[PDB]
Amino acid sequence: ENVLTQSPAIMSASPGEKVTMTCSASSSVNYMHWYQQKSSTSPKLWIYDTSKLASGVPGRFSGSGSGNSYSLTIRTMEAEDVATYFCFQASGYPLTFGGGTKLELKRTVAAPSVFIFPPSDEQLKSGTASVVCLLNNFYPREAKVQWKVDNALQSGNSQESVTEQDSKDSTYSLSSTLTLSKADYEKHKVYACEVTHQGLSSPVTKSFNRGE
Amino acid sequence: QVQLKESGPGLVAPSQSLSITCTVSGFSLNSYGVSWVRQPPGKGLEWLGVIWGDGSTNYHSALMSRLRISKDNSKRQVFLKLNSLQTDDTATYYCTKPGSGYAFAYWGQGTLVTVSSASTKGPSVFPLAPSSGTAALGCLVKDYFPEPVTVSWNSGALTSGVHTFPAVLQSSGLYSLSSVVTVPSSSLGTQTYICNVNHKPSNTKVDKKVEPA
Numbered sequence A: 001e002n003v004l005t006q007s008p009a010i011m012s013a014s015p016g017e018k019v020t021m022t023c024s025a026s027s028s029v030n031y032m033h034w035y036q037q038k039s040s041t042s043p044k045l046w047i048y049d050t051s052k053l054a055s056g057v058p059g060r061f062s063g064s065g066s067g068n069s070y071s072l073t074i075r076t077m078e079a080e081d082v083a084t085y086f087c088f089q090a091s092g093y094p095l096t097f098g099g100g101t102k103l104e105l106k107r108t109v110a111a112p113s114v115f116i117f118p119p120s121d122e123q124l125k126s127g128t129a130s131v132v133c134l135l136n137n138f139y140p141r142e143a144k145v146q147w148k149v150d151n152a153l154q155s156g157n158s159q160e161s162v163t164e165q166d167s168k169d170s171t172y173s174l175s176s177t178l179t180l181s182k183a184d185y186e187k188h189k190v191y192a193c194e195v196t197h198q199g200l201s202s203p204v205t206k207s208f209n210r211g212e
Numbered sequence B: 001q002v003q004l005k006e007s008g009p010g011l012v013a014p015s016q017s018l019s020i021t022c023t024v025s026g027f028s029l030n031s032y033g034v035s036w037v038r039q040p041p042g043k044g045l046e047w048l049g050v051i052w053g054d055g056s057t058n059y060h061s062a063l064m065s066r067l068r069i070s071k072d073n074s075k076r077q078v079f080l081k082l083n084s085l086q087t088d089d090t091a092t093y094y095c096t097k098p099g100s101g102y103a104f105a106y107w108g109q110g111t112l113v114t115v116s117s118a119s120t121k122g123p124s125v126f127p128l129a130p131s132s133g134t135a136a137l138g139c140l141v142k143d144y145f146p147e148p149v150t151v152s153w154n155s156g157a158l159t160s161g162v163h164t165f166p167a168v169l170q171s172s173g174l175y176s177l178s179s180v181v182t183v184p185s186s187s188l189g190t191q192t193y194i195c196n197v198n199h200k201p202s203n204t205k206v207d208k209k210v211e212p213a
């Protein structure tokens, strides 16, 4: 098969900035096509036959290339262009897709707002205590969240999940969920999550004491 | 308005087979091909095969002859059948219509297929209660299978400031997720916040009122 290589796999651009993503075919093709996919919903046809825009695609997009060498360009990056772009060839079977280039919007630094949630009483009756730390609306993506229970650093008992870049404000949000047995949850007093992020002069700590 | 839409089983046991139907409108299957693509979770697009208007077929050899595509023109239906699914056949499956440049101009919404012997299970929903100008609250949606669940707030009327996290597969074989919303502190006495959780595979709907403790 005719392997298509898109590198770099991830790039960022500030608003207004020109961006160019490449696609290399191992074997020469007469035409290259491209798709845009936002957040695991159906891809959309974006450019066909190397340089033709599909319907609904704004004029700031263009495509070029020939032989083994193709590109897609955005004249001026906008927040709505945050997506994964896939090249695709249909000149020979099997039909093949590139691995994707995910394009991020590089906006200004924004500090998370941090919230801590204790387990619900309803959950505790079941025998488990999930404690949630929420980092809301921050940029850039890199952030460290540590859980501290009566001053001891937890490890191996928490999981993080992160949103995609928000449509309008280009920020992330992040949850961190500490799971303990009820018995262990009742053995300790102070539950703290500690957040380190380049928007904060020093770490933020949000805590509670089980009880109220 | 060319439209395509997939219907499929969701859960399939290993070594059992997958059948999906693509129902189309706005075009005639006697004149146009329909392709199939899949996307494993968190990965790229992969082409599976095509049935052309004349009924001729082409398949990705990487499927090692496990795939057949057929169609019934009068019923506006294209059928995908994939045998002996294994864990790595887990993916969202799309039917698509080649159009401009023989590229895929129109796509179905996709149907998630999960390959697992594990059984359907509805979620438990717990409140993430607001603390003591902006406050955050939420719902923790725990211990369901398979994906997906949907979460809305106030039946879809509250959308601003909502963040519904991607589900994580736990060690247990079950999924969990949280959905949060930031709201004005001044609304907490006044406003009702209900997270509506729908898990179609189990036929579970939970509306959970979230208020201060």
Ligand SMILES: CC(=O)N[C@H]1[C@H](O[C@H]2[C@@H](O)[C@@H](CO)O[C@H](O[C@@H]3[C@H](O)[C@@H](O)[C@H](O[C@H]4[C@H](O)[C@@H](O)[C@H](O)O[C@@H]4CO)O[C@@H]3CO)[C@@H]2O)O[C@H](CO)[C@H](O)[C@@H]1O[C@@H]1O[C@H](CO)[C@H](O)[C@H](O[C@]2(C(=O)O)C[C@H](O)[C@@H](NC(C)=O)[C@H]([C@H](O)[C@H](O)CO)O2)[C@H]1O
Pocket (backbone or CB within 6 Å): A030, A031, A049, A089, A090, A091, A092, A095, B031, B032, B033, B052, B053, B054, B055, B056, B057, B098, B099, B100, B101, B102, B103
């Ligand atoms: C004809 C052919 O060889 N088709 C192949 C197809 O080859 C393409 C493809 O590889 C592309 C790159 O993706 O490169 C060439 O085409 C170039 C451009 O991409 C394309 O846009 C351009 O189209 C011209 C058009 O030719 C002009 O006449 C028009 O005025 O302008 C446009 C815009 O410029 O042409 C370029 C080259 O000049 C290759 O030609 O590749 C795919 C694989 O991706 C298949 O292999 C196609 O062959 C199909 O084979 C099956 C048999 O296995 C069938 O024969 C099928 O034909 C039908 C069908 O049964 O489905 C017959 C129907 O009459 C026809 N319906 C209608 C309404 O015409 C359908 C329909 O065309 C298809 O289903 C697509 O929707 O095809 C072959 O198409």
